[PDB]
Design a protein around this nucleic acid. Sequence first.
RNA 1: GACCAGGCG
Lengths: 97, 76, 54, 97, 390, 65, 48, 449, 194, 75
Amino acid sequence: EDPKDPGGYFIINGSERVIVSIEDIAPNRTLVEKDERQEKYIAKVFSYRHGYRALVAVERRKDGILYVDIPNVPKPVKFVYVMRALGLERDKDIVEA
Amino acid sequence: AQRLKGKEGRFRGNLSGKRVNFSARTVISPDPMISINEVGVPVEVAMELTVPEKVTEFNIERLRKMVLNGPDKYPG
Amino acid sequence: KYTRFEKARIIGARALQISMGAPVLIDVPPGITPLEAAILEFEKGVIPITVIRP
Amino acid sequence: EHTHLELMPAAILGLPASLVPYPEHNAAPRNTYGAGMAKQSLGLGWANFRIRVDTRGHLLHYPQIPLVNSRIMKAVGYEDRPAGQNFVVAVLAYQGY
Amino acid sequence: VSLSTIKSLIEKKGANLPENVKSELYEKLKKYNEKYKLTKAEIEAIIDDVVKEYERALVEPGEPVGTVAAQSIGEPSTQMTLNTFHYAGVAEINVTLGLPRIIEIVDARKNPSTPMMTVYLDEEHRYDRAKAEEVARRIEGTTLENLARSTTLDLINFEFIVEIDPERLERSGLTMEKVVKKLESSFKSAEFEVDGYTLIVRPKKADKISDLRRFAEKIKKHRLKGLSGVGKTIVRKEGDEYVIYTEGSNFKQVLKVPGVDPTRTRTNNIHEIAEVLGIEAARNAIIDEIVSTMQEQGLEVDIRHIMLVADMMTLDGIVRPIGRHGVVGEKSSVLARAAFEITVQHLFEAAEKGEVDNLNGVIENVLIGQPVPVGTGMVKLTMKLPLRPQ
Amino acid sequence: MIVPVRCFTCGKVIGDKYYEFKRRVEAGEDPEKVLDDLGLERYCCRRMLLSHVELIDDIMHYRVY
Amino acid sequence: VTSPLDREQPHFEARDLHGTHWGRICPTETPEGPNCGLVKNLALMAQI
Amino acid sequence: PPYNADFDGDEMNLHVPQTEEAQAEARILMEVQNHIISPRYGGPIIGGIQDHISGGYLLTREGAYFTRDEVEQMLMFAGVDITELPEPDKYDENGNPLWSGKTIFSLLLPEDLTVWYRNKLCDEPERCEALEKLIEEKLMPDPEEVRKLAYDGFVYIQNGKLLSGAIDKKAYGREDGIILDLIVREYGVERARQFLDQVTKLTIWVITHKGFTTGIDDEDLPEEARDRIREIIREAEERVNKLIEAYKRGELEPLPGKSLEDTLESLIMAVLAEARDNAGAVAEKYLGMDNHTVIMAKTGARGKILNITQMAALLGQQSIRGKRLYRGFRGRVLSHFKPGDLGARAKGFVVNSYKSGLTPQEYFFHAMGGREGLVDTAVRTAQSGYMQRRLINALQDLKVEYDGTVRSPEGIIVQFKYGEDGVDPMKSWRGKTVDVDRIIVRTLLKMRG
Amino acid sequence: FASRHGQKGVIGLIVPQEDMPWTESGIVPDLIVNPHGIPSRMTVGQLIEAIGGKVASLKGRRVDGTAFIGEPEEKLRKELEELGFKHTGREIMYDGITGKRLEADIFIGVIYYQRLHHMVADKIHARSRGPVQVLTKQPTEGRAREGGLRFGEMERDVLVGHGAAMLLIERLLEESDKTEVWVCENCGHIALED
Amino acid sequence: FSIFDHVLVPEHRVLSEEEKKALLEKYKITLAQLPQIKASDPAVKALGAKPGDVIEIKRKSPTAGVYYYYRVVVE
RNA sequence: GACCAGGCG
Ligand SMILES: [Mg+2]
Ligand SMILES: [Zn+2]
Ligand SMILES: [Zn+2]
C-alpha cells in the first residue's frame, strides 16, 4: 500500500467504490412560504421515521379556512375536523392548543 | 408505441438521421500556408478512405501505376 | 444564362456519362479525372445537353 | 463590537482551487477553468503503480515542483506527488502557427 | 440638361425597375447634376449600369428560401444577451425583452406577460404637460385602494374603515360623495358612511356576528374613474411631442377616449390588433415587433427573412402559432406531421380518416429515399443523341 | 524519478552536480552562492536543480519480477 | 457534495451562490456543463 | 469565423462523396470561395481575424518604413508576382533607399479601384472634413495635395494607390469589410481569394519580424491618475450615504413606478454606473497609442475598452439579474457586516483593480457575480434550439417557382414575389436592393478621367 | 497543454532549435504564446507568476504566493531590478532566421505548465466498411467497435438549404442501408419471392 | 373614423369580374390557391363584400415602394 | 443491446 493513501472507500468485486454526500433538506423543521398563483400560505414539513418520508402541509386560502393535506388522503380535510379526530373536541381546547 | 416516439424512436433516430460509412474524425490545428479552399489530411486517413474510379483511355496509365503499389504504399 | 443548379446538374450528368464509355469531345491531358474532363468540356462551351424550362 | 476572529481567509477555497497562485488577480471563470483542469494533468499518481492493476494509467517521466506555490500545498502533501513541469515562456506573436 | 429629360429617360430605359429605385435614381441624379454638369451619355450609361446590376441580383428559381430564413432567424438567438435593469422610473416601463419576447411573438401567445400600449395625442394637448396629465387621468382606471392614504380593519366590530389621501381623491375627477352616489345605484344598498376623509365600509353581510370582508373587498375593488384593465399611466416627452405609456391593454375602449389620436395609437398585443383592425395590421405589427426586439439586442437580420414568416403565419386570415397546434398542424402530409410531435395520435387519426399522402413535400421524400423537389431535383434536361466527336 | 542528465533548454550537463548542491544547502550555506560556485549562470539551468524531487527512492520497494 | 434536484430544469434559485456558503463550500470549483451549481466541493475549514 | 472554431481541443468531421454526381454537386455548389458573403445580412463573413488586423495597422501606420531586403523578402513570401522594385520613397543616412508601408500594400489592390471612408481610429473629425472637402470640390485631386493632408482616420484609395489612412477592422474584417465587399462584387470570387491569401500572408510576415508583445507594465498608470481615480471613487461613495440617510428620514419623493426602496436602489445603481464610467475615462486618457494593448483594442483586433478599465481601474458594481446582491444572512450578505446595512461596499461594490488585487469580500462578490454567466450559457441554448427546431420544421418546403412566386407543396400562393422585389439578400448591397450612389460615382470617375 | 490560470491550447508547430529567437543574455524560449490571448481573459496572475518564477529561479529560493498573504508584486519587481534585469520583465532578443534584433523588447519568464490526458492518439478514427447493427443494418456506434459518425437532422437541413439533392441521396441512402423490395401493383402489399 | 386612416392599415379595394378572371389566368391557378380572409373582418365589413370576391391590397413596404397582395373572401 | 455515472467543444 501507498502510505499517502487516505482511505475511505469500498472494494466491490475488485473495483473501488466511493459514496458521495447527498444535500437533503432538514429532517423535521417547519418551513413557510407563499405562492403567487393563489394567496395560499403553505407551510410544509417532512417527517422521518424508520426511513419513511411523509409530507404534511397546512395552509389557508381565499375562504379563510385552514386546510390540511395528508399522504394517502386526496381531499384536503379541514383543520378543525382533523383536530377533533385526535380528541379535544371542546372549542376551548382548540384555541388553548 | 415507444419504438416510434422520442429522440431515439424510429422517426427521429433512424429515418431522419443515420450513421454513414465514409467518414473520419480528429483534432484540428492552424495552418496559414494553404489557400482558403484546401484542407490538410493525415496520410493515415488518406490511405483508409477510398474514392471509386472508372478506368478510361485517358487515365489507364496512372491507374495501372497505382495498382502496382498495393495497399501499403501511399499512392495505391 | 444557366442557373447554377442547372449548371451543376449538367456537369454531373456529363461526368457520369464520360465514366461509362461515352467518347470525349475534346482533347484532354492524360491522367485527368472524368469530373475535370467534364468541367473542361463545359467551360469550352461544347456540351450538347440542354435544359427544358416551363 | 466584534465577537469572533477569522482564522485564515485563504482556507475558504477548496482543495484543487487552492493550487492557483495569486488567485485574487484573475477573473472568476478562468479560476473555475483552472481548478477544474487541475484534476486532469499527468504526473506520478501513486508510488505503487507498478503492482497496481488498473484499466488505464499514466506516468510522467520527470515531474517537478512548482517554483511559485501556495503554502497549503506543502502542508497537504501535494509536493510529494507533483504533476507538471516549468517552462521558459516568451510572449511573442510568431508566423501564424 | 433639364429635369424633364432625366424623367423621360428614366421612364423609357428602366421601366422594369421598382418604384423606390426609380425615385431614388431621380433624386440622386438631380443632386449630382446640380453641382457637376452632366452630359446625356453619362446618364444613359448610369441607367444601363443600374438596370444590369438589378438584373443580375435576382433570385435563382428553385432556391430553398424557407430553410435559409428559418436558420437566419434561429442562429443569432444563441448569442442573445439580457440586461433586465428593472428601474423604478416610470419613464422606463418594465417590459419583457429578448429571447422570451421572441418566443412569445412566434408562439402567438394569447395574452402577453407584460401588456402595454402607446397612446399618442391629437393636435391639441400635444405640446402641454397638464393637459397630457389630465388625459392620462381619463385613461387610467382608479380603484379605492389607489387613492387611499391607509386602511384599517375592525374584525372586533366586523366593519372596515377607509382613509383616503385628499391629494388623490380631490384630483381623481370623482369626489368623496360621488362614490356613494354611484354606489347607491350600483352593487347593493351601502351603509352611506359619508364623512369626507373617514369612510366606513360595513356591508350587509358584515353584521355584528359574522361575514366581515365578504363584500368589503368587493366595495374596495369597485371599478370607477377610468377604463378597465389599465392599472397604471405614465407621461413622457419624445422630442417635440408628448406621448403616454400605460400598463394593460384596452385598445377597443381606448380608441374612444376624447383627445386621443387614433391614427397612431397601438398596442403590443397581436390578437387585439387583429380583432380591431384586421389581419393586415397584425402582419405589420408582428414585423415591427420582431424587428424592434431584434435590433434592441444589437444583432442584424434582413427584413426579407421576417416577411416570409409573417406572411406564412397569417395565411388563413387569422393569426395562428408556429408549432404543434398551428402551422405544422395544417400540413397535408401525414408523415411530415407525424415525424414532428405526438406521432401515435397523428398516425391513428390518419388511419381512422383514411388519409392519403402524396409525397409532395421534402421530409417524406427524405424518409423514403427518392430525390427531393427542392433544388437540383427540380430541373429536367434533354439530349440530342446523334453526336460525334468534332 | 531521477535527476535529468542535461538541462532541457540549452543542453548543459547538470546531472552530476545535484547531490553536492543538496548537501551544501542542507549544511546551511547560501543557495545563491552555492549555485554560483557550481558554475550555473543562466537561470534555465538553476531551474532544473532548484525544483527537482527524488521520487526514485520510494518506488523501488515495489518489485514486479 | 451533490444535490438531488433534476439536471435538465434551469433551477435559477438553486444554482446561485449563497452568503452562508462562506467557509463551507468552495466558490470556484464546480462543473461546466448542465451540472453547474448542482455539484459542489467542501471547503478546507469545513467540519461535519 | 463561419465554422466558429477555435484551436483549443475542437474536433471536426470529414465526409467523402462517392458518386460522380455528388462530386460535381459538391464542386459546383459547395465551394468555399462561393460563400464569402453571408446570406443573413449581406456582408462578408470570411475575412481577417486577430493578427491579420494588427499586422495591417503596423504595416500601414504613419512613419512606417522598410529596407530593400525586408521588402523583397515579404513580397516573395506573400507570393506576389513581381520582377522589379518600384522607385524608393526616401533615403536614410549613407543613402540607403527606403519604401513606405502604403507603397508595399498598394501592390495587392486591383488597378482601377477607388473608394474612401472613415475608420474606427477617428479622434479629431475636424481634419477629415478638409479631405472630404478637397475630394468634393475636385473629383480627382492631385496626389501631392492628398499626401500633404494625410490622416489615419480617413482611408482613401485612388486608382489602386493608397494615399491616406490605415488598415483597420473596416478594411477587410468580418461583417465590416469594405474593400473585400467591393472586390467580391466587381471582379469575381477568384480575385477575392487571391487578394485574401496575399494580404493575410503579407500581414503575418509583417507582424512576425517587427515584433509584437504585451507585458505587465502595460497597465502602469502615473501617480496623478491613481489620485484622481481615488478622489472619484471617494466622492461617489460619499454621495450615496446622503441618499441612504435621506431615505432613513423620509424626506424623499418616490418615483411613481414602485415603492420608495426601489427608487433608492435605482438611484444608487445609476450613481455607481456613472462613477465607473467617469473613472474609466481618465484611464483611457492617460494611456497612449504607443502601448500595444491599446493598439490591439482600439483597432478591433481583440478586446475592448471595458477590459482596459477593469484591469487598470476599479471593477465596479456586481449584480445578479439586474439587482444588487441580497442573498445571504438575514439583513446582510456576509457575516462580516452589521445587520441592516445599505452601504455601497456592503452589497457588491468593488473599489479594486485586477492588478491591485481583491480583498476576500470582494473576491466572494466577484464569484457571486460571475456564476451568472456560466448558468445563463448553460440554460439559454435549450430553448434557443427548440425554437430553431420548430422554425425549421415549419418553413422547410417553400421553394421559388419559375414565375418568381413562393408556393406551398399543395399549391397555395404565399408570396406573389419573393421579398417584395425578388432580390436575394445574399446578393443585396447590405440589405438595399441596389446601391445607386456607388454606381454613379464609379461611372463618373471612369468616364471623367 | 494547459497552465493553471485557465489558459489551454494545442501544439501548432514544432520548431528546430536554431530557428527560435534567443535573448541577448543567452536564454532560448521553451514555449511561445500569442499576446492576443491575454487582454480578453484578463489573467494578470499569469504575468505575476512569470515574474515571480524568474525571480525565484535567479535567487535560488522558492516564492510564496498563498492567496491574500503572498509576496506583493512591487517587492518582486524591485528584487528583479536589483538582480540586474529590468523591472518591466522585458528583454532584447534576436531573430532566429534573419539574425538581427527585433524592434521591441519581449516579455519572457518562467511559468508552470501541465500536460492533459486528452491526447490525439486516442481520438483519430476512420471507417470505410465494417460491422452493422442486426436490427436496422446500419453502421455500428463507437470508436471501440469500428463505428461510424452520425449524420444528424440539422446536417440534413443544411444540405437542403444548399440545395444539393443528389448529395442528400448519396449520403443518406447510398452510404447507408439500401434494399430492393417486390411490390404487388394490384393490391399494394409487399410480394413474396421463393 | 374609418380604419383606413390608421398607419397600420393599407387601403383595400374590390376587384371586378374581368380583373378577377385576368388575375386567375395570369398565374395559372384556381380560386383555392389564393390566401384567405374572413368575412367578418373589419376591412371587408367596411367594404361590404360578400363571400367569393377577391380583394386587392396596396402595401407600402421598405424594400419596394408599392406591392400588391390579393386575398379571397371566405365566410 | 439497453441502462447508469463522469468528462470534451
Ligand atoms: Mg472551442
Ligand atoms: Zn540551461
Ligand atoms: Zn397483391
